[PDB]
Amino acid sequence: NAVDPFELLPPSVILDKFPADFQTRISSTKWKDRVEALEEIHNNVLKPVKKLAHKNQDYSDYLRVLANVIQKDANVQAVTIAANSVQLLCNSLRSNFTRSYGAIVLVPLLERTKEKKPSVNEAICSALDAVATYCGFDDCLEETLNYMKHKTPQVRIECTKFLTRMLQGWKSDGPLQNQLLFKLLPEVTTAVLKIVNDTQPTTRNTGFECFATLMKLVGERELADPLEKLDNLKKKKIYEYYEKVEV
Amino acid sequence: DLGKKLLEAARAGQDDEVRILMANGADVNATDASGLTPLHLAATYGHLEIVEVLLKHGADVNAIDIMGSTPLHLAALIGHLEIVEVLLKHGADVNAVDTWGDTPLHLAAIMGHLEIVEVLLKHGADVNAQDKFGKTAFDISIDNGNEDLAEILQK
Amino acid sequence: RECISIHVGQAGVQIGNACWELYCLEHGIQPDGQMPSDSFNTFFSETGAGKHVPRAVFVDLEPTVIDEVRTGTYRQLFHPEQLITGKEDAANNYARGHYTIGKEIIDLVLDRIRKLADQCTGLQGFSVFHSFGGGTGSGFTSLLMERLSVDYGKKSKLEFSIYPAPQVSTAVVEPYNSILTTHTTLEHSDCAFMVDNEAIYDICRRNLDIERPTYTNLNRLIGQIVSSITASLRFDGALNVDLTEFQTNLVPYPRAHFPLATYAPVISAEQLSVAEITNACFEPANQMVKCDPRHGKYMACCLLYRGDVVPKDVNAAIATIKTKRTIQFVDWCPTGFKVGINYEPPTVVPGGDLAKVQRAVCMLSNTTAIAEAWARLDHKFDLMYAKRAFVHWYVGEGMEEGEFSEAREDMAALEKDYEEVGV
Amino acid sequence: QQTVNLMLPSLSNKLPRLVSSCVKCLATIIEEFGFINVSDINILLSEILEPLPKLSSHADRNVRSETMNLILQIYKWFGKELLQELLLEKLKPIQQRDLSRMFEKYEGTIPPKQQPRLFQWAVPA
Amino acid sequence: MREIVHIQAGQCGNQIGAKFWEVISDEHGIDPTGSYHGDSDLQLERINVYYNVPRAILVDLEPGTMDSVRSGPFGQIFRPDNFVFGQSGAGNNWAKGHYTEGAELVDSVLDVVRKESESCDCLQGFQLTHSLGGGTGSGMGTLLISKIREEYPDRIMNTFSVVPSPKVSDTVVEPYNATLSVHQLVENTDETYCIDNEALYDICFRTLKLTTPTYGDLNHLVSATMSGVTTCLRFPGQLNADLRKLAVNMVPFPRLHFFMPGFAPLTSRGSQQYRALTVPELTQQMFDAKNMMAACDPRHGRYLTVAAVFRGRMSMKEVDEQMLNVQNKNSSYFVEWIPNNVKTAVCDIPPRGLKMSATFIGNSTAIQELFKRISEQFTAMFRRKAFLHWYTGEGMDEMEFTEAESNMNDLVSEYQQYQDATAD
Ligand SMILES: Nc1nc2c(ncn2[C@@H]2O[C@H](COP(=O)(O)OP(=O)(O)OP(=O)(O)O)[C@@H](O)[C@H]2O)c(=O)[nH]1
Ligand SMILES: Nc1nc2c(ncn2[C@@H]2O[C@H](COP(=O)(O)OP(=O)(O)O)[C@@H](O)[C@H]2O)c(=O)[nH]1
Ligand SMILES: [Mg+2]
Ligand SMILES: [Mg+2]
């Protein structure tokens, strides 16, 4: 007995909804112009709907201006309401963000994990979770690693927590020649150890989960090689999470 | 609603447009969401002519809101000495209490409005009045290192 | 601040004619729309050519009545897109007005309302004129009111219901239709002035001295009393200057929003004092709804005088009645009688059986005795629904039988709501 | 599906007693057979759910009454989370109450364990 | 709700049908050529209802009836296309009219019905005149009704069905035919005026003192009744204006839609009357069972709903008083659980040859007496199984008779239930 996708429900189109005074309001110098412009389409145009139009709808003009703010916009509020827009698209339009869409917002989002305001990290991470659950691990696996290597302490801990989030919901079943194994020891492990051996404890402690969520996926015997090279003292922290963690 | 426009004006402080709205018979004691009359709002933000205009048109000088705040509370909190004496002259409740147990004397003492403290005191403020936690205006001066206020409270 | 009026069914439409006839005489507006002469533009808009058009929609599921509008004295006054007609009427069936026929035209009607609301800048709300017992008046209105609570939800809506009366009653099922609309229109109406056609009949037989009144007779009397209530909105008085104030002054409970209107004086065309007319406001014979306020508690009370009136005479007549009668109020009321005056004289129609009076008054009072009127409908309803009589007509036009009971419980609950306030 | 797909258009006919009836007939080709060996069930569910709003607001008492039965026979097989997302929301509140009252009186697993009637190939199987 | 399509089927159908067109053509001021020679706007205000020329379709398996209509007075006015006639006759066999011969022709009729409906601004419904003891008027009429009911389900179906009586034809199969036809009407029509030949004879014989009434004599009473009940429909007026509103305020339970009509004053064929009756006199021809067109005693049952139509110039004040009087002075005869169940309407244009008149349409439970008579005659006939081979030979099943018998008895029981009902 197979199940249904409830997604069969007819789709809705939002392109006609946008107003003429939208592009200039988002591309304005006055912060409240931008905020209201974004906030309007979120509360009026996206939040109501429950399924966007798959057929013949190009959002990669709208999505690249959400990225422009999420990355560069100095107003943390305009970021927050934008990443919640990005999530809504990726959520109400599942199976759309194959590359052009997903990749247009991916590396901007990972840059902005730098934000430490709880509400904002909430919105950015949850949107990263959206682009992941419908594009995992297309571009994110590689680019997530890149930003674990980044200089800002916050982006390290948050992009590593991201790999942890993704890894718990990592999916089967090809052969064991998925993108995770092709780059497992070469890249994933070499980069997770950089987190495990960070100067900060709160950083290191994210690596300890992100390594014990890794062993859970790919066998505590396969990775016993870099386990030995690790401190006996760090080892029992890694094992601590291994015993609690589920994927 | 004409009672809601009179709140917008009395708050933001457009002295002239109060007279316009009141000449259209607006409710002088119109309540907003949280029970705040225009007299509350003008007394918070220091619009002396708007206070005296509303009072002489029959504004409830001792009106409370959803939290038991009278306009004299809010004037003594923010520190509007001009308005405090206008309210008191129009029969304000010098020893009014709000939901947290504070009197206007509590708020003027906490915010360091020594000039308003003395005015309230001379209108028969309760110096020994306590709040929820059990603290008087005198305890606040002891707790807040304000020897200038301790002397003004025992005068 | 431009109020839009809506007229549903023959009752609304034909009372509408009487009111806009009377509005145009009070404002010196011509049948062709011109004016040789602001506060009155609450109700009328203006053409570039100096023509004053009502802010009104006329609706009927059948041409006949609205056809006479647009081939009559005031055919030029309305834009033709304002007068909307279907073809099959509701046939005294709320179900057809609300479900079967009403859904075929509701969207056209809501669209034509948007065109009048788009011309308006600071729209206040809606005045709605309709019968109770009529199928269109009950069913379609209640539908339109539901949809106006969506498309204009954040603003006021006022009812002018025609309470049914066997002396002019066209249908057996008018109790059903009354209950059904009052249930579904209860949540969507902010205030509602009932008009008992029996009282208007009684008044016209006694004070206008007519043996068998016609509908024209009833309208002239009703339109006079409607004008008295809307005078504050059309001439910029002091009291009830906008639609919110009606709820502020008269409605101290969302559900209990049914004021009793009393109008004096009604003088045949074949002068009284300020005191004499104010005493007649507490005489049941001149009420618009037949009940006994002496058996009930007042939640509020407004007096709308108009004409040759001295503000001191009013205060004397008030003190007289506040001292020399026992008008019981509820304890949680401001027990102050609100007043407003408009010095312009009551206009009558040239030819009317109603005479021009020097001064006049219309007392709006939310008394609990108006529950008596709901009891009379509820009883008639109960007798027929006990046998499920005529119910197949409704159920066969898209209506669930349960809706009858859900409505009856809402009327029983309303009768309890009136009781608990008055004890 | 092929039988269902052919007799669906008749729901949109003038005569009520025909749509009254052939909604009863649709509902009992389901309660006795059911959806099995159906290529694209999603496409089929959409095609038979599409008219159910209008049918449930149809003038005829019978057309309505016999549409709540067809609703139940779809719930009786994969309801109610799905039908409340797709169809319960749109019906009169009184209606969706009766449908819930109808689901309580229903006992037995969410998809029926055994069909009251089997197909051609299925019976020998 | 404007136009009404009229149908007449069978001999009786076209007889009382043509008589009806004679009466209301005069009343509306139309001549046999089809031209207005009236003198009042109250006449052409709602002429669009029955006319375009009548909106009338003429039907019979008996081809002779064709000529009996056209050779009549207003026979020239009817549209030639709207005559639809068979080769042979049904010969008092309901099955021949409903299943065999009448069914073969019914398509041709529906084609004309469609044609006349096609060019209607807004149809109200239909109007069929026919007899129930016949083969064509009953069998093909009821089959026509169902065939329209399913082709036009958003419309009213209104019949003037005349009941057979031994006093007018000694044919014993009529109880069969009328029972089978009532089994149809209770399921297929919104309202049915029960014209009883038993009562038409008893009025022509006893009240009008005619020793041998002819069809023409009975048809005079009918045509005058029909113009009376259709007065609301044909002239401007507030109350009971269109067919649906009438049925809404007349029929509280779908199966109990058989009205007992009656009107006043009862006149002979072209006789002279004294001083126009007074309003209280007219009013006192309601319970007066000698004015009922159905052979039933209103005293023996209860009125569910009543419609009164007063025609002529008179005091609206006095009519209201007299009707409000007669209701409460006989309060035990009007059902209590339907308040304001009696409705009165006035039309200023009186009928032809009378200064005042009053028609009394009533849904009285006493009508069960009528269905009792038909059923007892049916059962007496059916228990001995007489003449069944006629019906069965035409494809009918013996079971049908049992179902129609039982279904009419359920109809009688229902009337008896609401008669004994209480408000308490
Ligand atoms: N006072 C007054 N009452 C009226 C007027 N017109 C109708 N009524 C009353 O309204 C009630 C219902 O009649 P209508 O309003 O005409 O019915 P409707 O709204 O047109 O609905 P349908 O005709 O069934 O489609 C009746 O009881 C009448 O007595 C009027 O012009 N003035
Ligand atoms: N009142 C009246 N009754 C008739 C007339 N002609 C026939 N009947 C009755 O109708 C029944 C016979 O049916 P009929 O209409 O003649 O047969 P059809 O031609 O097959 O419909 C008997 O009960 C007759 O008494 C008529 O002109 N007037
Ligand atoms: Mg009407
Ligand atoms: Mg014949």
Author numbering:
A (entry chain E): 297 to 543
B (entry chain G): 13 to 167
C (entry chain H): 2 to 38, 47 to 279, 285 to 437
D (entry chain L): 135 to 259
E (entry chain I): 1 to 42, 45 to 54, 62 to 360, 369 to 441
Q: What sentences appear in the manuscript?
A:
The XMAP215/Stu2/Alp14 MT polymerases are among the best-studied families of MT regulators. They localize to the extreme tips of MT plus-ends and accelerate αβ-tubulin polymerization in eukaryotes. MT polymerases recruit αβ-tubulins via arrays of conserved tumor overexpressed gene (TOG) domains (herein termed TOG arrays), which are critical for their function. Each TOG domain is composed of six α-helical HEAT (Huntingtin, EF3A, ATM, and TOR) repeats, which form a conserved paddle-shaped structure.
Using crystals with either a native sk-Alp14-monomer or an sk-Alp14-monomer with a modified TOG1-TOG2 linker sequence (termed sk-Alp14-monomer-SL), we determined X-ray structures for 1:2:2 TOG1-TOG2 array:αβ-tubulin:DRP from complexes using sk-Alp14-monomer and sk-Alp14-monomer-SL using molecular replacement at 4.4 Å and 3.6 Å resolution, respectively. Each asymmetric unit contained two wheel-shaped assemblies representing two sets of alternating TOG1 and TOG2 domains oriented in a square-like conformation (termed the TOG square), with each TOG domain binding a DRP-capped αβ-tubulin on its outer edge. The X-ray structures revealed that each TOG square is a dimer of TOG1-TOG2 array subunits assembled head-to-tail from alternating TOG1 and TOG2 domains. TOG domains were aligned along their narrow edges, analogous to four links attached head-to-tail forming an asymmetric square-like complex with two edges slightly longer than their orthogonal edges. Two contact sites, which we term interfaces 1 and 2, stabilize the TOG square. Although TOG1 and TOG2 domains are each 60 Å long, the TOG square assembly is slightly rectangular with 115 Å by 98 Å dimensions due to wider overlaps between TOG1 and TOG2 domains leading to 10 Å stagger at interface 1 sites, in contrast to the direct end-on corner-like interface 2 sites. Interface 1 packs a 668 Å2 surface area and positions the TOG1 C-terminus at 90° to a 10-residue segment of the TOG1-TOG2 linker and the N-terminus of TOG2. Interface 2 packs a 290 Å2 surface area and positions the TOG2 C-terminus at 90° to the N-terminus of TOG1. The total buried surface area stabilizing two sets of interfaces 1 and 2 in a TOG square is 1930 Å2, which is moderate in size and dispersed for such a large assembly. This finding suggests that this conformation may be meta-stable and that DRP binding and its inhibition of αβ-tubulin polymerization may stabilize this intermediate.
